[PDB]
Write a protein that binds this ligand. Structure first.
Ligand SMILES: NC(=O)c1ccc[n+]([C@@H]2O[C@H](COP(=O)([O-])OP(=O)(O)OC[C@H]3O[C@@H](n4cnc5c(N)ncnc54)[C@H](OP(=O)(O)O)[C@@H]3O)[C@@H](O)[C@H]2O)c1
Ligand SMILES: Oc1cc(O)c2c(c1)O[C@H](c1ccc(O)c(O)c1)[C@@H](O)C2
Length: 296
């Protein structure tokens, strides 16, 4: 079961590539590294928007599983990759660059809406093309959710005051990067994830923004002022159409005002949830992730 990962030097990719190697899977990583190579990765060169070159790669390296983690500005570059997988005809599982919310249920404002249009466009190509697929809807990476930052976990949470979105009482789910990686790779050849959406709903990590603030306060041993950032504030940031800041603002609204991660049931047959798939296999808690920062 050989795995090809596009986007392995990206923020999500690094965790997915590291996890794959840790699980002892043959892992090829597409290059436009050192740590990944020292752990066993085989680097192969190409871009996912070049159909004929991807066909060559999938054929030559006998690739079984393809995982794409390209960024929000490269979503449509996956069109060529899909056409290439359809042509070689041998792919056992494709995971497109999802790694967030359920794009078919959520309804963020613009310019968030348009990234989801692109993601839905890929999904429909995947399915009409007959590629077997798994969609990873892993909710929010465990960070302080800054309203205009695409990689928020790369920044330390606040040490002056908290900007609390709305009432600060809408739940979201937070998952460590290492857990996104680990559980993503368990799904790629699981019979139960074939042609499914996989939702990450770790119940201990279901927290609102106020609760998150208190977890950080308890780490810093000190309280901060809390101020309100309103729905209008966020929609005005979204309305500015500055890419990718306004996109993240759209998503923050969807998450912490409209409650998109938690407002639907996963009880239907096309939806599965990670903790029920992989029981007695604990997620890292937000307390524990925030502990990581407290080593600055
Ligand atoms: N839920 C969350 O908290 C969360 C947060 C972050 C992102 N996400 C989602 O995760 C997914 C990954 O985003 P990201 O932020 O990790 O992206 P990123 O950090 O921008 O990394 C994207 C990776 O894809 C590569 N790539 C882009 N175009 C390529 C192409 N045409 N050919 C081959 N490789 C290419 C890039 O390599 P180069 O550097 O060489 O261009 C880079 O390594 C996105 O769909 C995003 O919506 C979710
Ligand atoms: O569905 C989602 C949910 C999220 O929380 C996020 C998503 C997508 O993607 C966002 C994003 C937007 C533009 C980008 O270029 C990118 O790499 C990531 C990310 O910052 C946070």
């Amino acid at each position: 079961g050989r795995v090809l990962i596009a986007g392995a030097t990206g923020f999500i990719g690094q965790f997915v590539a590291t996890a794959s190697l840790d699980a002892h899977r043959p892992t090829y990583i597409l290059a436009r590294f050192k740590a990944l190579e020292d752990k066993g990765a085989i680097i192969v060169y190409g871009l996912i928007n070049e159909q004929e070159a991807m066909e060559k790669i999938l054929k030559e390296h006998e690739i079984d599983i393809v995982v794409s983690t390209v960024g929000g500005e490269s979503i449509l570059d996956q069109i060529a990759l899909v056409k290439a997988m359809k042509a070689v005809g041998t792919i056992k599982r494709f995971l497109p660059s999802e790694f967030g919310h359920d794009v078919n249920r959520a309804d963020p404002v613009e310019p968030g809406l348009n990234m989801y249009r692109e993601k839905r466009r890929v999904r429909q190509l995947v399915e009409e093309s007959g590629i077997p697929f798994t969609y990873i809807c892993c909710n929010s990476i465990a960070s302080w959710p800054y309203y205009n930052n695409i990689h928020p976990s790369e920044v330390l949470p606040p040490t002056d005051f908290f900007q609390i979105y709305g009432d600060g009482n809408v739940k979201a789910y937070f998952v460590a990067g290492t857990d996104i990686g680990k559980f993503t790779m368990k799904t790629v050849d699981d019979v139960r994830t074939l042609n499914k959406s996989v939702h990450f709903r770790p119940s201990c990590n279901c927290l609102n923004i106020n609760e998150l603030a208190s977890v950080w306060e308890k780490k810093i041993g000190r309280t901060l002022p809390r101020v309100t950032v309103t729905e209008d504030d966020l929609l005005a940031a979204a309305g500015e159409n500055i890419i990718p800041q306004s996109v993240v603002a759209a998503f923050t609204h969807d998450i912490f005002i409209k409650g998109c991660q938690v407002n639907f049931s996963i009880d239907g047959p096309e939806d599965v949830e990670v903790t029920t798939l992989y029981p007695e296999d604990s997620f890292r808690t937000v307390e524990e992730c925030f502990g990581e920062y407290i080593v600055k």
